[PDB]
Design a protein around this ligand. Structure first.
Ligand SMILES: [Mg+2]
Ligand SMILES: [Mg+2]
Length: 207
């Protein structure tokens, strides 16, 4: 059955990963972004403790792709001029997901070298606390946020490591390189490739 309700929030592909503009043309950038979500979902989906994967997004291509892999998809009702769009999409998703699970995990969508075991482990350690989170590879942001029988109160965005620490969420400290190594910039993509990215990403970076 599984007890965890997993959320991924995905912004517009047009807007996404501009720091990858140097190494990739517009359509290739969108594709790589979209395939990183595919590889992230795919590996997430092998985790045994999961009940559901919900993707929330205003982007009909990302909607189609997540739906195609057997995820729930929420249309993102965050407003245009919303000051804090990422954390608002996540809360909008939480509100839904929480009708069907006491324990909720938010996962970033840009973790192409994620391994199933990395996520499972992280979740197994998150259970030992109310609110917990995994930092990103460089330390400053956040790869995953975990809430067991309580509100996520997500503080995603810049210095989300520090802000989550302040929020009182406990820093989980497993190595889990593929979970921590998210991809915003060309050097991130290189680090991820050394860990070994999944098939959608590997194909997409070859065009
Ligand atoms: Mg990222
Ligand atoms: Mg980042």
């Amino acid at each position: 059955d599984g007890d965890i309700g997993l959320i991924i929030a995905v912004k517009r592909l047009a807007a996404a990963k501009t720091r990858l503009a140097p190494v990739f043309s517009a359509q290739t950038r969108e594709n790589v972004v979209l395939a990183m979500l595919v590889d992230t979902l795919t590996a997430a989906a092998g985790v045994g403790s999961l009940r559901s994967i919900t993707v929330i997004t205003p982007d009909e291509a990302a909607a189609a792709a997540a739906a195609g892999l057997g995820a729930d998809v929420l249309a993102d009702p965050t407003p245009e001029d919303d000051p804090d769009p990422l954390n608002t999409a996540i809360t909008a998703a939480e509100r839904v997901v929480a009708e069907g699970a006491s324990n909720i995990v938010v996962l970033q969508g840009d973790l192409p070298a994620l391994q199933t075991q990395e996520l499972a482990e992280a979740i197994s350690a998150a259970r030992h606390h109310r609110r917990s989170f995994v930092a990103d590879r460089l330390g400053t942001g956040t790869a995953v946020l975990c809430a067991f029988g309580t509100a996520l109160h997500p503080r995603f965005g810049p210095d989300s490591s520090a802000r989550h620490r302040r929020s009182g969420a406990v820093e989980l400290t497993g190595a889990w390189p593929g979970l921590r190594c998210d991809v915003d910039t060309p050097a991130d993509l290189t680090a991820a490739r050394q860990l070994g990215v999944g098939p959608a990403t590997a194909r997409a970076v070859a065009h």
